[PDB]
Each structure stands twice: as C-alpha cells, then as structure tokens.
Design a protein around this nucleic acid. Structure first.
Lengths: 123, 124, 242, 93, 110
RNA sequence: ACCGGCGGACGGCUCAGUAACACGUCGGUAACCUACCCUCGGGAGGGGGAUAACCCCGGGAAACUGGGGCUAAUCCCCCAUAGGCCUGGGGUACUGGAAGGUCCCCAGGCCGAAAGGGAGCCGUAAGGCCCGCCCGAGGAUGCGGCGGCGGCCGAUUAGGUAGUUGGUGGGGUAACGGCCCACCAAGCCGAAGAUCGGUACGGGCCGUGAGAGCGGGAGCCCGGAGAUGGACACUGAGACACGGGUCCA
C-alpha cells in the first residue's frame, strides 16, 4: 500500500494518492527517473486536480521515503540499504562546511518495503 | 598516509619509540609517474597554506630548447633512457633528467613534471 | 598540543618594555601585527588608559578611539590593539598635545611631549633596499613601512640611513647618512636611551653585525650594535631627545 | 565637612573629576545623598549631571577619601558612564 | 675563486660538484670549528674530532669531552686522516651530514 | 531563518607515555609557510548559472528525512588583461663580506584575480566623505626545520645496526633532508658505557642546610604531549580537530 505524491510542475501543486491491490505489482522493480504512461497507473488525476489532462500524460518516479523514513537515491543501484559516507546527494544536509556524515539510505530500485514514493507529471 | 617523519632508528642503530603521533604537515603525497600520452592531463592540488600545485600526469608535448636559446613546442614520441631508474624508461614514465625521443631527436628533460606541470628539455 | 595561532596573552608574560602592573589582573590585550616588532611597541589602549589616564576602564578608551579623536602619526586609528613603536608621534589635536615614544634608560617606553612643529616629522631608518619590476627601487623602513623611488636616485639611499619622513602626506624631507660624526640616539642594548656621536665602525664577518663606537656628549666611549643606532642629526639632534 | 584636593578636567569626555576628603571625626559615615548635596553647593554643579562612585573610609581613620564625576549634558552619562551609578544615585529607577 | 668571506686561500683546482662552497651551489653560514680528521672511509665524507675540557661544580676539576662531527668533504681538498681541518655549518645535506670542510690547515705529514 | 564574513585549530583540562635535538641556552634557514594587521604601486571590465525562507502535499515511537512551485547577495561558474610558475639564451643594477637569489631583454609553455555595500550631506545626476574586494612588493604576528653544548640509574645488560651509513641520479614535501625510490660502496656506533633494560615530561624554581652540598619538579609562567586503547580521512591560512566526522575493541 503505497502513498504516491504526484507533483505537477506547471501548477506547482502536489497531491497524495494511495495505490493498493495488483496495481502495487506494477510499481515493483522500477527505478528512479523511470517514465510510465498514466493509463495503467489507474488514478483519476483529471478528477483530483480538476484540470484536463491529455491522454499522453506520463509520470516519472523520482523520490520518496521508506517506512522508517529512509529516502531514495538514484545513484545507488539496487534497492538495498548500504551505509555511505554522505558528502552530497539526497538524504543528507551538511551544516558545517566540508562535513561528511555516514548515513544509511535506500537504493534506487523500488522495493515493497517503500511506503512513500514521489512522481512528477509530464504531458 | 605517506609519512615523511623521523627515521625510526638512531644513527648508532638505536631503536626509537615515537613519543608523539604524525602531524598533518609532515605527510607526503603520491608520486606522479607521469606517462606519455596523446593529450595533456593535469591536476590542480590545494596545498599547505592554501597554495596551488599543478601536477602533470599525462604528457603529449614538450619545450625542446636549442643551445642558442630558442624554444619549440614539439611532441614526444617515446623515452630513451632514464638514469634515475631503469624501470621508468620501459613504462614511458618521464622524470627530471630523463632522455626522451622526439621528432627533433634526443632531448634531456630539465623540468619537474610532478611539480611544474610542464615538460621542458634541451636538444642533444 | 597547540594547533593554530593564538589570540591571548597573560599579563605576567607581557614584554618588559611596558609600564603595567603585572599582578593587577590575569589577562592583557594581545598586540596585533603591525608596523613594529613586539619588543618595540605597545597597544594603544595601555597608552590611553594608563599613560594618559583619560579612561579608567578599557571600554571608554575603546569608545573614545572609535570616536577617532586620537591621531597616530596623522592617521586616525580606532583599533584598541594597535602597536605604537619607537619615535612614533601620537597627536591629539583637541588638546593640541603631541608626544614621541622613546626608550627609557631602563629600556621601557616613555612619552616625551613635543611642540607642534615636531608633530609632522617622523625619522625612519632604512631597514632594507630592494627593487621591484619596472626597475622601481623600494626601501623598507625600520617601522615596517615601505616607500618607492626610481632607479636614478638609488645612490642617495642606503640601509640604516635615516630619513625625515613627512608622515601627514608621505613626503620625504631630508636624508641623514650613516657616517662618522653623525649624532646618534640608541634604541636598544645596555646603552639604551643614550645620545652621542659615531666614532668608529667595526665591521664584523661571519654573520655578526657591525659595532659602532659612540662617544657621549661628555666624551664617554661605549659601543653598540649598528641596528640599535638611530641617526637624529648631522652634528646636533634635529629632534627633542631626552 | 568636605575639602577638595583634585579637580581635573577631561575634555575628550568633557567631564570633571573631583577627588575630595570628608572629615567625620567621631560620627557615623556620611551617606551618598548628603555629600552629593554638599559638594554641588560650593562647586556649583548641575545635580543631575553629577555622579559619585566611591567614598572609602579607612580603618581607624576619621578622614575618608571620595571621588565624584561632573558631566555637562544628560546624554553623556547614558552613553559613556556605566549604568550602576545612576541607579545607586537614583538617576535611573 | 668566489669569495666565502673566511680568511683562507681557496683550494687551487676547482671541482664541478654542486656542493663545493668555492665551486658549487651551497653557501657558508653559521658556526665554524677546527678539528682533526680521524675517519674518512665513506665517499666524500669526513668524521672530524674535537677535544676540550669540561668543568664540574662539585669537584672543581676538568673532564675531557669529545665531539665527533660529520662534514662533507668536496674533492677540491680531499681530506685524509691526521689532518687539521676547518669546518662550517651548512644546509641539511643528509640524515647525518650537516657540515662542510672549508680549509685544511696542516696536512697529515705535519 | 538558508547561503554568507569571522570564531568554534585560541582560551578549558591532565602529567598515563616520552630518555627523545623532548627540553635549557646559543647560532639557525641562503632550504620553508603564513588567514586576521600595516606601508607602497596597480586593478576591480563583460557574461551566464544557482537553491534555501515561503506554498502544498508526505515517512516515521525513531534518529532523521522526500518531491514539486518560486528566489539573492560580497553564492558559483565563464571570457579578457594583469599576475603566478617552469625552462633555455643573453646582459647588467640591488640586498649581503660570502653565495646564490632579486633585476632587464629575448624565446618556449603552463597556470591564470576581484565586489561592491546600508545610511547620511551636497550634487538632476556625476562625483566627494564611511566601510568593503583583488594582484605585485615587503614588514610584522605566529609556525615549520637544522646544528654546537648542558641535562638520570644498572656490567649478575658487551658488542650493536640492514634502509642500516654514505655517494650517484631521481621522486614527494610549503620547505632541505633516505623523508622515499633505482643503482653504487661498506659504512655508522661502542670500554670516556653503544645496545638492552629500569626509571622519568624539561626548565624558571622549591625544601633543608653556615655553606660546599643533598633532595624534589604537583601547586604560578614558558616549552613538550595527550581527548578510553587504537586507526583514518574531509573542510579549513591554521587539525587528523574535547562540546566536527568515519572504523575495530
């Protein structure tokens, strides 16, 4: 049961939806930056956002957070957890200049353990 | 860590145990082992006191100078002889004082490519 | 152990050239780098607070310096750690009061009051000669300032020569050379705060500086390092020297 | 009875420093307000521009030293002089 | 003949080494000493010895103390054992070498 | 509040080790470094990009963390000139007795600056006063490094040393140096005490004593060194960094 945060760049508005059922199996095994057409995603986006969407609307998967709160990183192949000394990239805020913190983050690939996923709309 | 610290032995062979650790200022750095290539590849390194050291790792051109004093930017074919050590010449590794084969002929390098970043030599 | 530069100085370890109560408090103001050396100068705050007594507390001395009332060789200096060295002229025009810092016989610095006519002349000893690209000669003075001249006039200058230096607008006035008979005032050594005339110049090899033999006004002959001898006049001192 | 030795003018601050001695043989130490009203009379100063810090009476001594300051304008104390000796003198609540 | 500013005649013949104070690159500064050569086995190296007395507070007699110094020996002088030699401080040459011979006052035969 | 200028590398603490060019003193860099400071000469032109705050919708008892909408400077980057560096040839002028270095020209090659700003007065503005930025040249504050001498005990610890010692030619260093590498050679130290072990931060000083002297070095200052034992990077002018970071126990 995933929470999908669908963000529209044109409106700058993002709305959360829930994916359940065999629809979930459609998202298993995908990566970050992956594009997918709207039709099989089965969300009434035109009806949530209240604005017309041509049938050629696609969604790109970019981000999200895990059950505990572990975010996503395109850089790390696979879905597994690997402790990494974080100098730059998602899931890390350096405060003092030159800081490097070792954080544990989820890999790029989408796993069932993910509960929050983020997608961006294109037309 | 490359430590350019105290010799761990006395002149009379006496063992010395270090009373203190390694300070940051006293460590060294990787030898360049500059190779001959079709292009010129360089690295700018931040150093002690915020200075900058340019380090040539791949070399493709050289300043061959005549005894008169004129310089020419001419390419490098291969290395002839390295009196410093015989393994470098086989591996096309260039260092100060090495003999290099170029279009003009034989040249002796009077430069420090690991520190200077450039290759200057005199025709022979 | 220590890892980088420090911003503190205990009152006990203060230089011996200062008139300060050493056991009054724990801490003293660290002199920032400046024109002179550590042994040669003092923070301005100690001049204002102690020598002049205008301000009882350091805070009000800092306030007054921020107001800029005090002129240091014709330049306002609001910093409260500025080092003021030998033969610097401190002028406060509101009182019209002008003093010159000079070494004591004991070797500590003291303020000699001077008239207004002496407040725009500073004598500077030529510490070193160099020359920069464009063939522009440069002279580094004993007080850490630098002046530029052209190549033609280079023979009119030498190291250790004194120059009367119009500091209000940076105008050279006169050049006093380093020759026998010149009137000389001592800056350091056991013969500190003495004035006499040069007699002999003892050149010394092996890195050892030259020794100059100075005869006092009464004819007493002593010796002193060349660096410590400051020429102040051709035959008679051009400045009021205790 | 109060008699002066030191009357010194600091024109960078435009303020007068008064070092004075109080004769109090056999009687308790005078208070701040009494000497404050005493000096101002024969020195002819503005009471509000005038402030006292310390009055030290030594052991076994009937003559006590004291120091007062005399400013000119109402902002000089607010800027330069610290905030205690207005409150101790009542100049600030 | 390039001056070093020490009162001694330079060695006659010149050498091409970059370490001869008269005929090289390195310069002379610092302390000077006089000693005797006792060992010169390794290449262009000398081990000069200097003898002196040391006083002690408790017994007020003297105690001989010796100082061995490793100075560089350029070819222009070619020091040997039994020779009295003038030595000068130099830049760090090697792990132990920090001095150089600048004069030979008496040969071994003397 | 985010970038951003600085400080957090000093100041606080202890005496476990460390017999050491650790330290005391004297020379000592000609073989080095230097943010914040001062003086002199010059520059500060043109162009592009940038994401916090905020809006919304999200994960988790957590720690802590995602996306999209939008934005700046003295944030970043690009172009130009100077400037920095190296090499060859030539010719001088300066520092210093010395050396080389610094300088002028030619040649080749590489690298290769900036920032304007709140307010106020006048000025239509411009421009002046205040503060701020960069290049060259120093000085200065500190720092690194080399050497001579001084500074405990054991002979029921007598030979010790293999990169060891020196040379040639190279590397890395801010910098010279076997510090490191290839070759060349057998050197180096020791009975005046090597090596090994015991013991121990050095000094100004302190206790006692008529003093010769004996003993001690915690309490205040200087120097040396260490964050539980150990090991390691990044960022910064400055660290392997007590209230920054990573790994084993």
């Amino acid at each position: 049961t995933f929470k999908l945060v669908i963000s529209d760049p044109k409106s700058g508005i993002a709305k959360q939806v829930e994916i359940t059922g065999a629809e979930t199996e459609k998202l298993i095994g995908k990566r970050i930056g992956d594009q997918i057409p709207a039709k099989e995603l089965n969300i009434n986006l035109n009806e949530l956002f209240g604005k017309e969407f041509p049938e050629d609307v696609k969604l790109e998967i970019r981000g999200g957070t895990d059950k505990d709160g572990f975010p996503m990183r395109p850089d790390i192949h696979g879905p597994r957890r690997v402790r990494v000394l974080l100098s730059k990239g998602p899931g890390f805020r350096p405060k003092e200049k030159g800081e490097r913190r070792k954080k544990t983050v989820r890999g790029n690939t989408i796993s069932p353990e993910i509960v929050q996923v983020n997608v961006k709309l294109v037309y | 860590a490359i430590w350019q610290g105290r010799s761990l032995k006395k002149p009379s062979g006496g063992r010395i145990v270090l009373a203190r650790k390694k300070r940051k200022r006293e460590l060294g750095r990787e030898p360049s082992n500059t190779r001959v290539a079709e292009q010129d590849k360089r690295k700018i390194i931040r150093t002690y006191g915020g200075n900058r050291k340019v380090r040539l790792t791949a070399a493709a051109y050289a300043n061959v100078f005549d005894k008169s004093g004129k310089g020419r930017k001419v390419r490098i074919i291969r290395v002839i002889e390295n009196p410093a050590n015989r393994q470098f010449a086989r591996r096309n590794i260039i260092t100060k004082g090495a003999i290099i084969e170029t279009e003009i002929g034989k040249a002796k390098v009077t430069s420090r490519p690991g520190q200077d970043g450039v290759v200057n030599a005199i025709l022979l | 152990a220590r890892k980088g530069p420090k911003r503190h100085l205990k009152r006990l370890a203060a230089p011996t050239s200062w008139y300060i109560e050493r056991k009054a408090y724990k801490w003293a103001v660290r002199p920032r780098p400046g024109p002179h050396n550590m042994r040669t100068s003092i923070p301005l705050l100690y001049i204002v607070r102690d020598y002049l007594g205008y301000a009882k507390t350091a805070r009000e001395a800092r306030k007054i310096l921020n107001e800029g009332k005090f002129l240091v060789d014709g330049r306002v200096r609001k910093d409260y750690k500025f080092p003021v060295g030998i033969m610097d002229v401190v002028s406060i025009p509101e009182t019209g009061e002008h003093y010159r810092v000079l070494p004591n016989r004991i070797g500590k610095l003291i303020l000699h009051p001077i008239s207004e006519d002496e407040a725009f002349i500073k004598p500077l000893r030529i510490r070193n000669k160099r020359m920069i690209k464009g063939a522009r000669v440069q002279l580094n003075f004993h007080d850490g300032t630098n002046h530029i001249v052209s190549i033609a006039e280079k023979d009119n200058y030498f190291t250790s020569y004194t120059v009367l230096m119009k500091v209000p607008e940076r105008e050279i006035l006169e050049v006093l050379p380093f020759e026998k008979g010149a009137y000389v005032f001592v800056t350091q050594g056991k013969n500190v705060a003495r004035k006499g005339r040069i007699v002999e110049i003892k050149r010394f090899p092996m890195g050892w500086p030259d020794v100059v033999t100075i005869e006092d006004e009464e004819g007493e002959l002593f010796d002193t390092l060349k660096e410590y001898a400051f020429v102040v006049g051709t035959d008679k001192p051009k400045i009021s020297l205790p | 009875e109060i008699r002066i030795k030191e009357i010194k003018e600091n024109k960078l601050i435009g303020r007068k420093e008064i070092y004075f001695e109080i004769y109090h043989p056999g009687e308790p130490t005078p208070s701040r307000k009494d000497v404050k009203g005493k000096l101002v009379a024969m020195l002819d100063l503005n009471p509000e521009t005038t402030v006292i810090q310390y009055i030290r009476s030594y052991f076994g001594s009937y003559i006590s030293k004291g120091y007062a300051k005399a400013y000119d304008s109402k902002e000089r104390m607010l800027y330069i002089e610290p905030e205690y000796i207005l409150i101790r003198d009542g100049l600030i609540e | 003949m390039r001056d070093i500013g020490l009162r001694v005649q330079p060695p006659a013949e010149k050498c091409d080494d970059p370490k001869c104070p008269w005929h090289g690159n390195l310069k002379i500064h610092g302390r000077v000493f006089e000693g005797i050569v006792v060992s010169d086995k390794p290449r262009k190296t000398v081990t000069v010895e200097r003898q002196y007395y040391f006083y002690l507070n408790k017994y007020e007699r003297y105690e001989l103390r010796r100082s061995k110094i490793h100075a560089h020996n350029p070819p222009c002088i070619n020091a040997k054992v039994g020779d009295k030699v003038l030595i000068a401080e130099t830049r760090p040459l090697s792990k132990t070498k920090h001095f150089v011979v600048v004069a030979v006052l008496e040969r071994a035969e003397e």
